[PDB]
Amino acid sequence: QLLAEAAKHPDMLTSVRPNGLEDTPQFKIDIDQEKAQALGVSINDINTTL
Amino acid sequence: LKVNQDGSRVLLRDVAKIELGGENYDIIAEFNGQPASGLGIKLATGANAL
């Protein structure tokens, strides 16, 4: 919103841009604790291996 | 926390109450009888109080 408002003032502000990176896709892994416990595999071992 | 032979699941809510509470309950402050908090600020050595 601030960037758009600044862009709406070309005669006072120029090239108002973010000094940072935008959000990007990420690969989320949901480990089911119930399933891991049922199959006899520790969460610590899973996380360490990954 | 545990899986029973029946197939039921023991959760942390079953054996305990989960709350958002002070790290320690030692100090409690009142201002004119009303609940309050505060910061007691001690000046650094060789610094100007003003």
From Swiss-Prot, chain A:
Q: Phenotype on deletion?
A: Loss of susceptibility to contact-dependent growth inhibition (CDI); inhibiting cells still contact the target.
Q: What do we know about what induces or represses this protein's expression? A: Positively regulated by MarA, Rob and SoxS transcriptional regulators (at protein level).
Domain of life per record: Bacteria
Where it sits in the cell: the answer is: Cell inner membrane
Q: What does this protein do?
A: AcrA-AcrB-AcrZ-TolC is a drug efflux protein complex with broad substrate specificity that uses the proton motive force to export substrates. (Microbial infection) Involved in contact-dependent growth inhibition (CDI), acts downstream of BamA, the receptor for CDI. Its role in CDI is independent of the AcrA-AcrB-TolC efflux pump complex.
Q: Which family does it belong to?
A: Belongs to the resistance-nodulation-cell division (RND) (TC 2.A.6) family.
Can you state the subunit structure given in the record? Homotrimer, with large domains that extend into the periplasm, interacts with AcrA and TolC. AcrA may be required to stably link this protein and TolC. Interacts with AcrZ. Part of the AcrA-AcrB-AcrZ-TolC efflux pump.
What is this protein's name? Multidrug efflux pump subunit AcrB
Source species, please? Escherichia coli (strain K12)
Q: Which gene encodes it?
A: acrB
Q: Coverage of the whole protein, first to last residue?
A: 701 to 750 of 1049
